[PDB]
Amino acid sequence: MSIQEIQKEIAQIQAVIAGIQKYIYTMMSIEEIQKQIAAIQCQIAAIQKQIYAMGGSGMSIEEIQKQIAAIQEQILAIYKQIMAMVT
Amino acid sequence: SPAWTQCQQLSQKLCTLAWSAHPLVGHMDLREEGDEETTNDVPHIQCGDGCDPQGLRDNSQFCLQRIHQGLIFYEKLLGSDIFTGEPSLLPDSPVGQLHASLLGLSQLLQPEGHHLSPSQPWQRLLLRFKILRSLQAFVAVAARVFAHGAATLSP
Amino acid sequence: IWELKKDVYVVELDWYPDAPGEMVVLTCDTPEEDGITWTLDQSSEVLGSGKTLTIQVKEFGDAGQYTCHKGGEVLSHSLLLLHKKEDGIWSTDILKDQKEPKNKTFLRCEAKNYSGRFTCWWLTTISTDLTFSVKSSRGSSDPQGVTCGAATLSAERVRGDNKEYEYSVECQEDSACPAAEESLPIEVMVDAVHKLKYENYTSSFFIRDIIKPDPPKNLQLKPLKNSRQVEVSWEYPDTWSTPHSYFSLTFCVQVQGEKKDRVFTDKTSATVICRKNASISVRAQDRYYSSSWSEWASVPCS
Ligand SMILES: *[C@@H]1O[C@H](CO)[C@@H](O[C@@H]2O[C@H](CO)[C@@H](O[C@@H]3O[C@H](CO[C@H]4O[C@H](CO)[C@@H](O)[C@H](O)[C@@H]4O)[C@@H](O)[C@H](O[C@H]4O[C@H](CO)[C@@H](O)[C@H](O)[C@@H]4O)[C@@H]3O)[C@H](O)[C@H]2NC(C)=O)[C@H](O)[C@H]1NC(C)=O
Ligand code: NA
Ligand code: NA
């Protein structure tokens, strides 16, 4: 997958988690969920350095795509927790 | 034609819920090149639909028909698999309350009026942000129409 | 190579050290067929003869004004500018990244109302040899007319030990519908030329999303005798869309000089409790859609 596409996916993920973060302000542990959100944002920053650089090593493209998918699943789990809390 | 102050109250509530029911993104976020075609299939209160103050003074029925159509459209969208599918929102969720408020207003306008989809959960979620910010734009125009009618058209 | 405007051309280049660049063929815009020569900028060195000139464009020394002549008279001119692509990305040297609301935000636009008029701003460190050109439309595939004025200096300030120049431009949609629900965004397109370097920039938005009302007008305080209670009053700003019965505003009233003593109202008056050295401040937002709050209007307490 292109670097342009990967940066688009990262931008979307940054927008969604920023929005979830703001939504939590407007409202089973909130402090815990906010820490998980911040940790994802933190990992996005570390991943961005892997991108702008283009038994142990750094990340390939495929490995970046796999981590993005994993981050999306973590965001979906958080989103589902929050939606259940406000319902 | 019909209960201006009642429509004002309900359309104001719709604006509040459209913004509070669900997380938001920035207006420059989640934009893409194909959005021009996607926008075309959604109904809008367009130039010339009669919802400007002068058109409302002349004959508000044109505007209110367009508002009713848009409300019916967004009710169908908010009740579709985009919102009920994985990650699922329940009918009693804030988005479910927003859906019920669309229905309440459309019923007030025409009591006897009668009432595409992605498969991946991440894509459903993205589309929810896009649909709801479109809805925010629509219900803001509707709320101005009813506020102005209540202020200037109520005998 | 493509034509930016009459007799002005842009050559796109993959830009890296010792890059070979692009071969271009310039044609003298003339009926003549014999006795033609070419030069560049001020030098009289004849670079070539004939109706056409083939040149290798790979650095700024190859850009500039190419002139063809016959019989000592100038026949035509061709100005070549370079558009650098650095590692697959077009250069953005000329404008400063404002990094808000996101990375690569070079243009910022605001509207005071729904009239279809708006203003855009950008920042640069460059002081000389600098030209901007602004165009706008509503929609990209089927563009609807927007008329823009000239971009000109609006402020000069010092930031990080160097001058920062702010430019602004005013634009007006030709056939605006203040009350309608926009379905196609405004596009703003800015050409920037610094010497022989060409860049361009874009912003896309709905007017409703860049709304920022002017501050409340005529903010006044009426103190109550023997109390710190005060009646606050104000008016809608002159520039806001009319009629106000349609384009309603909402307001935030704050008393401050640590905490946040705020109330929200749709009226143009409120009752609050003042204290010394504190100010009463009021700001405004579109009642029905969450765009930007106005700047504060403020009056001191007492
Ligand atoms: C911001 O900056 C960018 C990057 O520099 C500009 O993008 C360039 O825009 C120009 C002008 O539109 C483009 O040049 C034009 O391209 C047209 C399409 O060319 C493609 O397709 C042909 C096949 O038909 C290919 O051969 C070609 O290589 C391209 O792949 C052409 O039709 C245009 O030709 C014009 O001139 C000839 C004679 O010279 C006429 O016969 C034609 O009828 C026509 O009038 C022209 O070449 C250029 O391709 C863009 N670059 C990229 C990378 O996309 C943006 O335009 C600029 N933004 C603004 C607002 O100016
Ligand atoms: Na820059
Ligand atoms: Na007093």
Numbering used by the authors:
A (entry chain C): 2 to 28, 46 to 72, 86 to 118
B (entry chain B): 27 to 141, 150 to 189
C (entry chain A): 23 to 279, 284 to 328
Paper text:
The Alphabody scaffold is a computationally designed protein scaffold of about 10 kDa molecular weight, which was developed to serve as a therapeutic agent. The scaffold does not have a counterpart in nature and is composed of a single contiguous polypeptide chain designed to adopt a triple-helix coiled-coil fold. IL-23 adopts an atypical heterodimeric structure consisting of a p40 subunit encompassing three fibronectin-III-like domains, which is linked via a disulfide bond to an α-helical bundle subunit (p19) that topologically resembles long-chain helical cytokines. We show that affinity-matured Alphabodies can bind with ultra-high affinity to IL-23, but not IL-12, via an extensive interaction interface that engages the p19 subunit of IL-23 to abrogate IL-23-mediated signalling in vitro and in vivo.
Crystallization trials of highly monodisperse preparations of the IL-23:MA12 complex yielded two distinct crystal forms that allowed us to determine crystal structures at 1.74 and 3.4 Å resolution, providing the opportunity to visualize the binding epitope in detail and to cross-validate structural observations. MA12 folds into a left-handed triple-helix coiled-coil structure, with the binding surface located mainly at the C-terminal half of helices A and C. In agreement with the ITC-derived stoichiometry of the complex, one copy of MA12 binds to the p19 subunit of IL-23 and is oriented parallel to the longitudinal axis of the p40 subunit. The respective binding interfaces feature 20 amino-acid residues contributed by MA12 and 28 amino-acid residues contributed by p19, burying a total surface area of 800 and 840 Å2, respectively. Five hydrogen bonds and two salt bridges are formed upon binding, while the rest of the interaction interface can be described in terms of van der Waals contacts. The binding interface is further hallmarked at its two ends by two prominent attachment points. At the other end, Tyr110 on MA12, a conserved residue in all matured binders, inserts into a pocket on IL-23 p19 defined by the BC and AB loops and the N-terminal part of helix D. Furthermore, we note that this segment of the AB loop in the p19 subunit of IL-23 is disordered in all currently available crystal structures of IL-23, suggesting that the interaction with the Alphabody induces the observed conformation. We were intrigued by persisting residual difference electron density emanating from the Cδ1 position of Trp319 in IL-23 p40 up to the last rounds of refinement. Indeed, mass spectrometry on tryptic peptides of our recombinant human IL-23 confirmed that Trp319 in the p40 subunit of IL-23 is mannosylated.
